[PDB]
Structure 1
Amino acid sequence: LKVRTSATFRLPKTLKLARAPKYASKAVPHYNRLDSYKVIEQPITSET
């Protein structure tokens, strides 16, 4: 038998594997949703 200095039993640590999907989630990455031309819309030309 093992020696257990603590009377509390904890969940053992087990191996966790990274995902290895057999097909891509979307197969086409989306382009930049905020490029320079979308960030700046138009200058403001009021007198102030």
Structure 2
Amino acid sequence: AKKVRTSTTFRRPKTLQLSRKPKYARKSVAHAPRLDEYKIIVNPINSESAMKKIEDDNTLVFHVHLKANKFTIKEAVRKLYSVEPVKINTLIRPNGTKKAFVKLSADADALDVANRIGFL
């Protein structure tokens, strides 16, 4: 039974590609989550503009990690202070540190939360 070629091209046949089944794991111990909430949130900001945002905009201002994004900041704030943010804005300061504006919901009082943190 001679196989009929209808393409005038020979294209490399598909062969089984086994998945990796190592005899040993290259790393003995998996690293811990390198960016957890205690590393994500560095410090709050208590400058006069930071206070103004707290007392009017219902917004908390934090010094945060460079590798922290908006999603991780929201999860860190939710897990560290039990208040869910409605909005997060971030900027890299001219000194190289990241600063996050965290707008809380109407359900939460930014003044109260600042008081529990202790920097107010």
Q: TM-score range by the shorter chain?
A: over 0.9
How many angstroms does 1:27 deviate by? 1.2
How many angstroms does 1:44 deviate by? 0.6
Q: Secondary structure at the match of 1:6?
A: coil
Please list the CA deviations of residues 1-48 of structure 1 after superposition, one character each: whole Å capped at 9, or x if unmatched.
111111000000000001111111101000011101010000011011
> 2:29 is aligned with what amino acid?
V
Q: Percent identity of the aligned residues?
A: 65
Q: Secondary structure at the match of 1:42?
A: strand
Q: Is 2:38 the partner of 1:37?
A: yes
Structure ranking higher in strand proportion: 2
Match of 1:3 in 2: 4
Match of 1:22 in 2: 23
Structure 1: segments with no counterpart, 5+ residues: none
Tell me which of the two structures has the higher relative contact order, counting C-alpha pairs closer than 8 angstroms and 6 or more residues apart. 2
Structure ranking higher in helix proportion: 2
Which runs of 4 or more aligned residues in structure 1 lie more than 4 Å from their structure 2 counterparts after TM superposition?
Answer: none
Q: What value does the CA root-mean-square deviation take over the aligned residues?
A: 0.6
Distance in 1 between the 2:28 and 2:21 partners?
15
Structure 2: segments with no counterpart, 5+ residues: 50-120
Instruction: Point out the structure with max Rg over C-alpha.
Output: 1
